[PDB]
Scaffold this active site. Structure first.
Site, mmCIF file in Angstrom:
data_model
loop_
_atom_site.group_PDB
_atom_site.id
_atom_site.type_symbol
_atom_site.label_atom_id
_atom_site.label_comp_id
_atom_site.label_asym_id
_atom_site.label_seq_id
_atom_site.Cartn_x
_atom_site.Cartn_y
_atom_site.Cartn_z
ATOM 1 N N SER A 1 55.550 40.359 43.943
ATOM 2 C CA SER A 1 56.245 39.611 42.888
ATOM 3 C C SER A 1 56.987 40.608 41.996
ATOM 4 C CB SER A 1 55.356 38.640 42.107
ATOM 5 O OG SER A 1 54.466 39.261 41.211
ATOM 6 N N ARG A 2 58.282 40.391 41.794
ATOM 7 C CA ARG A 2 59.159 41.264 40.982
ATOM 8 C C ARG A 2 58.840 41.226 39.498
ATOM 9 N NH1 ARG A 2 64.077 41.708 44.845
ATOM 10 N NH2 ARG A 2 63.283 40.461 46.447
ATOM 11 N N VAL A 3 58.468 40.036 39.052
ATOM 12 C CA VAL A 3 58.072 39.679 37.698
ATOM 13 C C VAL A 3 56.688 40.269 37.373
ATOM 14 C CG1 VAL A 3 57.921 37.649 36.125
ATOM 15 C CG2 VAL A 3 59.404 37.511 38.053
ATOM 16 N N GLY A 4 55.971 40.878 38.334
ATOM 17 C CA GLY A 4 54.645 41.427 38.066
ATOM 18 C C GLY A 4 54.703 42.363 36.869
ATOM 19 N N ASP B 1 61.446 34.915 44.261
ATOM 20 C CA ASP B 1 61.194 36.103 43.419
ATOM 21 C C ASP B 1 59.910 36.856 43.792
ATOM 22 O OD1 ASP B 1 63.304 34.900 41.618
ATOM 23 O OD2 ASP B 1 61.686 33.691 40.801
#
Ligand SMILES: Nc1ncnc2c1ncn2[C@@H]1O[C@H](COP(=O)(O)OP(=O)(O)OP(=O)(O)O)[C@@H](O)[C@H]1O
Ligand SMILES: Nc1ncnc2c1ncn2[C@@H]1O[C@H](COP(=O)(O)OP(=O)(O)O)[C@@H](O)[C@H]1O
Ligand SMILES: [Mg+2]
Ligand SMILES: [Mg+2]
Lengths: 468, 473, 475
Positions: free
Chosen positions: B339-342, B314
């Protein structure tokens, strides 16, 4: 219990045995045959069992030339692996891969014989000592300090200086510690091996040293097992005598290539660049045994040949995971006359931590690596634009990096035939003091040529006086 | 019958006749007492992979099927101990009295069994926690060349979990026994062993154990997730794990592909890394986050195993050999790492200050391509260059020095709002420590409020309280 | 039993049934009279490498055992003759009645069977004899691009061995018949054929002969060494020897490695080059020196076969295709060329002047590459930049012009001590010819002292005798 030769294919021989009397893997077999008539030749050969194939047949690797073998020859099983003499009787002697003496001195008559294959120490027997071994070599003592009981690896192509660097380390370390020494010479030159033996025999150091050789001209069975004969002899002094020892190996790359030459004939599928599928496992069988334990210590200096100057090759690549210190030698430095030619930006050690070395040592090494990287990042800009276009800061950084790269050079005692200079030994205090004095700009008004081939900083200053 | 006999023996591989009713992946027992896995089923033979010393096995030896899948002990009892790939103790501290056993091969939680990751997993590292955030159920890859600081980021992250309810699992694959022992003493020195499990397949161990190691470490992490707790799992190098599988597959004669590896190798790492997840409230709300590591040869990120694992994770943290020798010590490529979740992973206070840092660095990366000349660059361009150099310095951090999230917020806030801009580039590192000691020593209310609310909105005091420090130090 | 029957034939390879009592490496005879080596012994068949024209061999032909491991004739009878890789004559001068035969495959002498090398093998070339010394027992590689003078250095060496008791062997591997004839006539024109043996396996001969050629030539050189005499061997190109082995190995279906060469390719050259040695006094004190040659594509010294042989030899002489077209000869790149035996084999008078010269001529390359202009550098840099130019001129030397060691010492003493620093660079070559003729015509006492003592005792006479030439209207 006996068997017969069924096939012969270069270094590989296939043997068939009686019902259920098959030898185990790594077990040694013997061929002793006398010519029955003038069309045959006498043979004395040892074979090592590699794998079981079915039809009561075993595949093996020969330790010497297979020339003169005939299908149907009788073979005998020794009942155990290749076993070599161990103990104090082995000190001051030269040996073959099979543990037989090369020197004209007579039989060894040792009290015990150990098998070449033994399990390594468990996790609870390991040590965590963080002690600096001083070499007197100005580049290693600063940028890649050598840990006592750890492995130091010398990586380089053809003719960069690996043997000249190993022999200077042998000379400097074995002088003051007076412990037991071992040299394997897996790919060591017979001419250099002869030069080493004569100096050790006249200086008396031979009386504390074990030697095993296993020359370049030998078949792959010998080039493959010789590193384990020297290691099995160095293990006895650690395990049964509790001593601190030095183990030198001029070439572990040859050990890897000997396994590669063997692999196709065994019937295995090849991997990247033609290597054996078992490459990392075979390197770990050798490297996990070379460790210090709660009984005693083994410190080792090893040289690794880099084919075609490519560090991405499976053999050099697989080896880096096992070393506590790594020294890389560059042709660009050698072709420019800077010796020992160690690359300051790729050389490193486990011991280079603020917790294991002084604040002054850590800060000087940091400032050296950084100024050389800044100089490496500018050789393109200096090629496209005139040097008169660079800023004052970059102008000073170039002059300091120029002085530093050659102040890292040093004349060795073992190189007097090549350097035309006496030879020098430098203590850690004068290395740190030397680089700090250049980094701080106290020596800006001194020519770059004064820093080449001098052992210490006071010498550089009189070398400047010898030139108006 | 269920009895088979050996017909060939090689480097950890054996082949046998009989065993007609054996199942794919079953454990098999040799007459010597050693064990192996039945991996290939053929018309007339079974390919067995040995889990121990193979030199005692010979042609004609009897082999028997066990009727059991490979399983490992799990529970609270493994905490603060060192074990091998089969869960057996190697620390010398006696037996392990675990009450439950779990198979190393289990299915990952489904799409409906999950929930979005909304809470942070603090690493204590200013470059990761600000610019490359990690949530409590995310898979982040650590990637770069040899000796660039890959294990240091994983170990510093495990040490920061002291005051948090996270069990840490460190899995060493193909490592030297001496580096494993050196890492274990570092974990005890910092007290991380009060919540850490260590699993280790050494370079001397057979390829079958180096293959089983990540799955066993994953099974131990799943136990905590299934009971509503949080867990973190580190794989020291997936590159050596792929090499160990290549060895077994080539010796078993499976047809090769790209870079000599088996076609099966994507399914190897994806069947592993998809087990890290944050569960739904009906399942218990538990979590498992993963930090796999990969080593690149001479910077080749385009290689088979690297591109394969880059596509599974991810987010990725990129380490440069160039930054490391230049004096940017954590050595992270912030303009390439992602990071995509950032945003979702971070707290409200951290996100706000991360944003300005991101624009400043992006602009600096645009300008540095032509930063070679600076005496000619317009004064306006210099403002962009100067700010970017200073934000780079704040990201520099010594090993084993995690900064607490409120302090990372307090310092990034100062750099982004220009309060560190006026300080000289070399003096910035000194000013950072002095300012943090000042804020904690007198008027500690700023650090207390950020821990409770986690949203700032109280900056008038932070500004005025900062001016009192900059007045003379 | 000692007879078999062919089952398959191809491009120099055959397979036969029977031959039960054959031994690995034995010579085998076909019904046509051609011969081959039994390499592989299988469950029911034998793999054979044919040592001649295979187009006369057919399936079902009867093959027979010779009962002998592959061997070649040796002795005094081969001197002044031309032979193929099997030792058979090609000069047209009749049969060879040699009394002894030796196997072409033998182990090299051990660590204790040897002794250090100290007696200098003078080449007659000033850059080699000063910077890259050669001694009896050493193995020196000659490396460079095609058409660069590699064969000229080997032939100039085999001729400077005129008034010495050294026996020379020249092995031509994969060379054109026209170039072989030009080498033989050059050796007869200079009289080198009175002490030389020529072994040939030309570009049109089967690859199996181009494979046996270096081993056959080595066996002939070992005869002199085993009897206490000194010998020298040249291998015209090891790059072609490797291509021939790649061909045989790929046709036997062995799996390739780097650059399609077989894994066995290091053992090929290292098994041949380690047989060159200086034996101990108990073994007879004899010697065998080797001069292999290699060809680089576009100057790629870093290629597999080149670096592989560099890892076996005692030194390298690298020749530049770039410098050669700039009017420079021998065109040796001193910044890359070096020897592992060097300094020790060279005479004391030469050690006293040549010692620091290689490292100086290496840093010289950096300075001329780094200095952007001639007007911005300081006095300390200008002084060292000029010295390297003058030394580079002194190192230049034309073809077929050997210079004796005593004359080389005097001119190198002049340059390494700055006596050429006032003379312009374009006049330095005139100085070298005028100075050597002056010393030989009226101060033979300097050259005669160096010839008998091999060392420099008192330089005071040479400093004054040299200064007199300078005052006497120098160039
Ligand atoms: N932030 C840092 N500050 C200073 N030194 C550091 C820092 N991070 C790592 N180092 C140093 O870098 C060196 C290598 O670290 P580490 O072993 O973790 O790198 P690695 O990439 O994982 O190496 P390897 O590939 O061999 O496992 C060690 O000497 C370590 O102390
Ligand atoms: N420290 C040194 N000082 C001077 N010359 C050196 C030094 N190191 C290497 N050389 C030169 O380069 C060669 C190095 O040979 P060697 O060490 O055997 O190379 P390698 O083992 O790397 O193939 C020698 O010919 C020597 O003259
Ligand atoms: Mg060497
Ligand atoms: Mg690591």
């Amino acid at each position: 219990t006996r068997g017969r030769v069924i096939q012969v294919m270069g270094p590989v021989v296939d043997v068939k045995f009686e019902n259920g009397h098959l030898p185990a893997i790594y077990n040694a077999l013997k061929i002793q045959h006398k010519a029955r008539n003038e069309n045959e030749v006498d043979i004395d050969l040892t074979l090592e069992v590699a794998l079981h194939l079915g039809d009561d047949t075993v595949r093996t690797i020969a330790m010497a030339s297979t020339d003169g073998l005939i299908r149907g020859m009788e073979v005998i099983d020794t009942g155990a692996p290749i076993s070599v003499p161990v103990g104090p009787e082995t000190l001051g002697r030269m040996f073959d891969v099979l543990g037989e003496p090369i020197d004209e001195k007579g039989p060894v008559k040792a009290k015990k014989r150990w098998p070449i294959h033994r399990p390594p120490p468990s996790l609870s027997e390991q040590s965590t000592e963080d002690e600096i071994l001083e070499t007197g070599i100005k580049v290693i003592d600063l940028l890649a300090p050598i840990p006592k009981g750890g492995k130091i690896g010398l990586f380089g192509g053809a003719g960069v200086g690996k043997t000249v660097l190993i022999m200077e380390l042998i000379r400097n370390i074995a002088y003051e510690h007076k412990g037991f020494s071992v040299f394997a010479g897996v790919g060591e030159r017979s001419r250099e091996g002869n030069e080493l033996w004569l100096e050790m025999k006249e200086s008396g150091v031979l009386d504390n040293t074990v030697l095993v050789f296993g020359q370049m001209n030998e078949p792959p069975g010998a080039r493959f097992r010789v590193a384990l004969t020297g290691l099995t002899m160095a293990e006895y002094f650690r395990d049964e005598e509790g001593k601190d020892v030095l183990l030198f190996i001029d070439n572990i790359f040859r050990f890897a290539q000997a396994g590669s030459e063997v692999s196709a004939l065994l019937g295995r599928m090849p991997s990247e660049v033609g290597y054996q599928p078992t490459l990392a496992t075979e390197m770990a069988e050798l490297q996990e045994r070379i460790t210090s334990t709660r009984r005693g210590s083994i410190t080792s200096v090893q040289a690794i040949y880099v084919p075609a100057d490519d560090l991405t090759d499976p053999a050099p690549a697989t080896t880096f995971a096992h070393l506590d210190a790594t020294i890389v030698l560059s042709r660009e430095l050698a072709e420019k006359g800077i010796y020992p030619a160690v690359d300051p930006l790729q050389s490193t050690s486990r011991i280079m931590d603020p917790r294991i070395v002084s604040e002054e040592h850590y800060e000087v090494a940091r400032r050296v690596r950084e100024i050389l990287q800044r100089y490496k990042d500018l050789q393109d800009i200096i090629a496209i634009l005139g040097m008169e276009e660079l800023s004052e800061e970059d102008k000073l950084i170039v002059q300091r990096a120029r002085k530093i790269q050659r102040f890292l050079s040093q004349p060795f005692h073992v190189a007097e035939h090549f350097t035309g200079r006496p030879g020098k030994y430098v203590p850690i205090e004068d290395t740190i003091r030397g680089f700090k004095e250049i980094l701080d700009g106290k020596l800006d008004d001194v020519p770059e040529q004064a820093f080449y081939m001098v052992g210490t900083i006071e010498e550089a200053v009189e070398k400047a006086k010898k030139m108006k | 019958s269920d009895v088979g006999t050996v017909i060939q023996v090689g480097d950890g591989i054996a082949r046998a006749h009989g065993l007609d009713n054996v199942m794919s992946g079953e454990l098999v027992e040799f007459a010597n007492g050693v064990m192996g896995m039945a991996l290939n089923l053929e018309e007339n033979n079974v390919g067995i992979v040995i889990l121990g010393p193979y030199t005692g096995i010979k042609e004609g030896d009897e082999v028997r099927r066990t009727g059991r899948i490979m399983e490992v002990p799990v529970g609270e009892e493994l905490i603060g101990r060192v074990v091998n790939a089969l869960g057996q103790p190697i620390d010398g501290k006696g037996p392990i009295n675990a009450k439950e056993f779990r198979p190393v091969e289990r299915k990952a939680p489904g799409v409906v069994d999950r929930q979005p990751v909304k809470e942070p997993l603090q690493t204590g590292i200013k470059a990761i926690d600000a610019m490359i955030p990690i949530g409590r159920g995310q898979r982040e890859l650590i990637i770069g060349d040899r000796q660039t600081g890959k294990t240091a980021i994983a170990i510093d992250t495990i040490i920061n979990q002291k005051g948090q309810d996270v069990i840490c699992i460190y899995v060493a694959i193909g490592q030297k026994q001496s580096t494993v022992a050196q890492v274990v003493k570092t974990l005890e020195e910092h007290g991380a062993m009060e919540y850490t499990i260590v699993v280790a397949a050494t370079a001397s161990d057979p390829a079958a154990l180096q293959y089983i190691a990540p799955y066993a470490g994953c099974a131990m992490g799943e136990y905590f997730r299934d009971k509503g707790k949080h867990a973190l799992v580190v794989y020291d190098d997936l590159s050596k794990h792929a090499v160990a599988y290549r060895q077994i597959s080539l010796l078993l004669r499976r047809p090769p592909g790209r870079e000599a590896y088996p076609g099966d190798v994507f399914y190897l790492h994806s069947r592993l890394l998809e087990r890290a997840a944050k569960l739904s409230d009906e399942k218990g709300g538990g979590s498992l986050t993963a930090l796999p590591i990969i080593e690149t040869q001479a910077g080749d990120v385009s290689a088979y195993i690297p591109t394969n694992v880059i596509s599974i994770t991810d987010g990725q943290i990129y380490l440069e050999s160039d930054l490391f020798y230049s004096g940017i010590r954590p050595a992270i490529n912030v303009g390439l790492s992602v990071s995509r979740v950032g945003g979702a992973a971070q707290i409200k206070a951290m996100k706000q200050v991360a944003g300005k840092l991101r624009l400043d660095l992006a602009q600096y990366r645009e300008l540095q391509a032509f930063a070679q000349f600076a005496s000619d660059l317009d004064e306006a361009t210099r403002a962009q260059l100067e700010r970017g150099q200073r934000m780079t310095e704040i990201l520099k951090q010594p090993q084993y020095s995690p900064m607490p999230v409120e302090k990372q917020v307090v310092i990034i806030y100062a750099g982004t709002n220009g309060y560190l801009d006026d300080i000289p580039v070399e003096k910035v590192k000194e000013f950072e420590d002095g300012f943090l000691e000042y804020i904690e020593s007198k008027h500690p209310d700023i650090l207390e409020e950020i821990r409770e609310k986690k949203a700032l909105d109280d900056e008038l005091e932070e500004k005025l309280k900062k001016a009192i420090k900059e007045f003379k130090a």
